[PDB]
UniProtKB/Swiss-Prot annotation, chain A:
Gene name of this polypeptide: BRF2
Superkingdom of origin: Eukaryota
Role summary: General activator of RNA polymerase III transcription. Factor exclusively required for RNA polymerase III transcription of genes with promoter elements upstream of the initiation sites. Contributes to the regulation of gene expression; functions as activator in the absence of oxidative stress. Down-regulates expression of target genes in response to oxidative stress. Overexpression protects cells against apoptosis in response to oxidative stress.
Protein name per the record: Transcription factor IIIB 50 kDa subunit
Natural source organism: Homo sapiens
The protein's assembly and partners: Component of TFIIIB complexes. The TFIIIB complex has two activities, alpha and beta. The TFIIIB-alpha activity complex is composed of TBP, BDP1, and a complex containing both BRF2 and at least four stably associated proteins; this complex inhibits the transcription by pol III via its phosphorylation by CK2; YY1 facilitates the TFIIIB-alpha complex formation. Interacts with TBP; this interaction promotes recruitment of BRF2 to TATA box-containing promoters.
Induction of its expression: Down-regulated by epigallocatechin gallate (EGCG) treatment.
UniProtKB/Swiss-Prot annotation, chain B:
Clinical condition linked: Spinocerebellar ataxia 17: Spinocerebellar ataxia is a clinically and genetically heterogeneous group of cerebellar disorders. Patients show progressive incoordination of gait and often poor coordination of hands, speech and eye movements, due to degeneration of the cerebellum with variable involvement of the brainstem and spinal cord. SCA17 is an autosomal dominant cerebellar ataxia (ADCA) characterized by widespread cerebral and cerebellar atrophy, dementia and extrapyramidal signs. The molecular defect in SCA17 is the expansion of a CAG repeat in the coding region of TBP.
Major location category of this protein: nucleus
Source organism: Homo sapiens (Human)
Coiled coil: none
Protein name (database record): TATA-box-binding protein
Entry binding sites for DNA: N11, R47, K62, N101, R138
Residues of the full protein shown: 159 to 334 of 339
Gene designation per UniProt: TBP
Tissue distribution of the protein: Widely expressed, with levels highest in the testis and ovary.
Compartments reported by the entry: Nucleus
Swiss-Prot record, chain C:
Assembly mode: Component of TFIIIB complex. The TFIIIB complex has two activities, alpha and beta. The TFIIIB-alpha and TFIIIB-beta activities are required for transcription of genes with TFIIIC-bound internal promoters and PSE transcription factor-bound external promoters, respectively. The TFIIIB-alpha activity complex is composed of TBP, BDP1, and a complex containing both BRF2 and at least four stably associated proteins; YY1 facilitates the formation of TFIIIB-alpha activity complex. The TFIIIB-beta activity complex is composed of TBP, BDP1, and BRF1.
Organism: Homo sapiens (Human)
Lineage: Eukaryota, Metazoa, Chordata, Craniata, Vertebrata
Function: General activator of RNA polymerase III transcription. Requires for transcription from all three types of polymerase III promoters. Requires for transcription of genes with internal promoter elements and with promoter elements upstream of the initiation site.
Tissue expression as described in the entry: Isoform 2 is highly expressed in cerebellum.
Upregulation: By Epstein-Barr virus (EBV) resulting in the stimulation of the EBV EBER genes.
Protein's name according to its UniProt entry: Transcription factor TFIIIB component B'' homolog
PTM notes: Phosphorylated by CSNK2A1 during mitosis, resulting in its release from chromatin and suppression of polymerase III transcription.
Taxonomic superkingdom: Eukaryota
Myb-like domain location: 10-60
Subcellular location: Nucleus
Disease linked to the protein: Deafness, autosomal recessive, 112: A form of non-syndromic, sensorineural deafness characterized by postlingual progressive hearing impairment. Sensorineural deafness results from damage to the neural receptors of the inner ear, the nerve pathways to the brain, or the area of the brain that receives sound information.
Length: 60, 178, 97
């Protein structure tokens, strides 16, 4: 839910950056993530290419 | 009409009820083409080479089969498994056979940019490349799920009859043609 | 500890490849035992049941004819002789190499 929140504000955030804090694993959390989204059917944007690069490049 | 191509079929799934209870341990004991583990699972696994299929038989008497290319081949293989059970000594009978699913696929001979499709069919499209490369399309008529890739290949699942697969195919033809 | 951490699909971890003579034992097992992948997992302690199923899935793509030919060339079944044949043939393979 925090993730989709940031997506609403087109706020760039990636998948593992969240899972870092949650003891999760790719399959566990991705499968679940699909489950709620299809359950709720809420509209949510994708990761827009240029957005993520600003924060990624600035970290060097 | 389509561009001269109608989707092929990939898999068949079907079920049948044999009309009696079975001893799974005996069947696994005496079947060359079977695998069973009583201590973790409640059904015996078996396979036949033609039609190249597998069957899953519970102690409750119901059976699930996969691996078929067509419904007739699934029905033939299910009858074959019924004969196998009969020769094992149980009063097996072939009743209430039904197909449950089959898989279809096709290719359009040109690439497709999935981003536009997700940008225009949000209500049906899923585009999460970091999770699964393919785009997922939840089609409503017929109640079919189509899987689409950048190469122009399309895969269809969720039908009870073949006409559903081809119906979804020509339903999505104009959409992908856009 | 950094935010660049990569995440990708690690479920394809490096499994031990299959030997040609091991494949020959697999075929004589279809000849000798059948398709009871749990039982075969027992005759091959170094392979588990899922490995047997994956082996079958790989073999069936091209070698169905050899599968049938082995299955019809039936042999009486003995676990003890099977184990001896395995380690003796493996040792012979290493000695030849």
């Amino acid at each position: 839910c925090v993730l989709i929140t940031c997506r609403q504000h087109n706020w760039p955030l990636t998948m593992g950056a969240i899972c870092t804090l949650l003891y999760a694993d790719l399959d566990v959390f991705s499968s679940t993530y699909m489950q709620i989204v299809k359950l709720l059917g809420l509209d949510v944007p994708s990761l827009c290419l240029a957005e993520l690069v600003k924060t990624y490049c600035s970290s060097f | 009409g389509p561009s001269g191509i109608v989707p092929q079929l990939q898999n068949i799934v079907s079920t049948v009820n044999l009309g009696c209870k079975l001893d799974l341990k005996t069947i696994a004991l005496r079947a060359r083409n079977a695998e069973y583990n009583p201590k973790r699972f409640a059904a015996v696994i078996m396979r036949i080479r033609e039609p190249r299929t597998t069957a899953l038989i519970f102690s409750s008497g119901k059976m699930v089969c996969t691996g078929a290319k067509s419904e007739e081949q699934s029905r033939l293989a299910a009858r074959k498994y019924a004969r196998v059970v009969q020769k094992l000594g149980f009063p097996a009978k072939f009743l209430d056979f039904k197909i449950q699913n089959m898989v279809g696929s096709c290719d359009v001979k040109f690439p497709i940019r999935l981003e536009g499709l997700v940008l225009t069919h949000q209500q049906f499209s899923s585009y999460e490349p970091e999770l699964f490369p393919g785009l997922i399309y939840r089609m409503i008529k017929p109640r079919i799920v189509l899987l689409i890739f950048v190469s122009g290949k399309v895969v269809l699942t969720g039908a009870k009859v073949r006409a559903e697969i081809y119906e979804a195919f020509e339903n999505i033809y104009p959409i992908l043609k856009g | 500890g950094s935010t660049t951490t990569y995440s990708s699909f690690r479920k394809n971890y490096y499994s031990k490849p299959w030997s040609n003579k091991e494949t020959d034992m697999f075929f004589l097992a279809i000849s000798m035992v059948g398709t009871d992948f749990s039982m075969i997992g027992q005759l091959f302690p170094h392979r588990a049941r899922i490995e047997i199923k994956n082996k079958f899935k790989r073999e069936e793509k091209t070698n169905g004819w050899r599968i049938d030919k082995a299955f019809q060339e039936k042999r009486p079944f003995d676990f003890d002789f099977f184990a001896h044949l395995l380690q003796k043939v493996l040792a012979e393979e290493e000695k030849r190499k």
